[PDB]
Design a protein around this ligand. Structure first.
Ligand SMILES: c1cn2cc(-c3ccc4cn[nH]c4c3)nc(Nc3ccc(N4CCOCC4)cc3)c2n1
Length: 263
């Protein structure tokens, strides 16, 4: 699973940035052809997180999850993934306002199919958000950034923690530090919110502690100008306060599969 630095070229246009360091476009010389890749380049432990991300990515084989080519012990540590060229789903819709809405259903479904796969595989993402949905084509998205993910113990249905996208986290993650596919389901509702908001941030202006209060009050995000009906009704079901009543991806994909067909 290790790669030859010499076989890898990096364009200077940094693709983006995060705590680990930067991500650059690059090209990796394969058997015979070259592959366009996106490469996480690691700038005091971030390493372990990165290899954790690669470990997870290494066991995932599914059409709606970004594929990892390998790792490169080169100048810095590098995680090389197959390139999703259109990039993050939020930034994209932020400047493709006039994208149909029926196109979005098909997209969030794919997300849910990838997320089902992840549920069944008993892995929890823990950072599910539109920004982590990468576009291959305008009609093909994949889930990325498994830096927080965890493989679940065979004996439990949740991971328990000992810096958080609070606005994407379910109440139980915040109250008890408990992360399950159901928590990912909550996030998937915030993701759907974003998508159907053509990339608007959720809970605009609010602080985490204030988002936390609003949800406990039984309040949820308003419907985004233009969203269909069931899609908002799906969001609210995803945002079920009680874990055990909240639908799993098995369920949420199932409904998702249909609704689209009828559009
Ligand atoms: C496969 C795995 N990937 C990971 C990341 C990526 C980029 C930045 C960050 C920051 N934290 N994690 C990241 C992952 N980005 C990928 N592709 C991608 C494609 C296009 C852009 N854009 C195009 C528009 O202008 C801004 C940059 C951008 C990206 C991609 N394809």
């Amino acid at each position: 699973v290790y790669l030859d630095r010499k076989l890898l070229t990096l364009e200077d246009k940094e693709l983006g940035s995060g705590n680990f360091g930067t991500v650059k476009k690059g090209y990796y010389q394969m058997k015979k052809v070259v592959k366009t890749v996106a490469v996480k380049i690691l700038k005091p432990a971030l390493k372990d997180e990165l290899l954790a991300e690669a470990n997870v990515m290494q066991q995932l084989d599914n059409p709606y999850i970004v594929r990892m080519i390998g790792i490169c012990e080169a100048e810095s540590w590098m995680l090389v993934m197959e390139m999703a060229e259109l990039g993050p789903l939020n930034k994209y819709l932020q400047q493709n306002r006039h994208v149909k809405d029926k196109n979005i259903i098909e997209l969030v479904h794919q997300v849910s199919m990838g997320m089902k796969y992840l549920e069944e595989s008993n892995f929890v993402h823990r950072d599910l958000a539109a920004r982590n949905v990468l576009l291959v084509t305008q009609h093909y998205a994949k889930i990325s950034d498994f830096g927080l993910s965890k493989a679940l113990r065979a004996d439990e249905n949740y991971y328990k923690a000992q810096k958080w996208p609070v606005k994407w986290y379910a109440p139980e993650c915040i109250n008890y530090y408990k992360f399950s596919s159901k928590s990912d389901v909550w996030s998937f509702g915030v993701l759907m919110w974003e998508a159907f908001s053509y990339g608007q941030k959720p809970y605009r202006g609010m602080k985490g502690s204030e988002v936390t209060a609003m949800l406990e009050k039984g309040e949820r995000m308003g419907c985004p100008a233009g969203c269909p009906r069931e899609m908002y009704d799906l969001m609210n079901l995803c945002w079920t306060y009680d874990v055990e009543n909240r639908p799993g991806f098995a369920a949420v994909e199932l409904r998702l599969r249909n609704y689209y067909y009828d559009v």
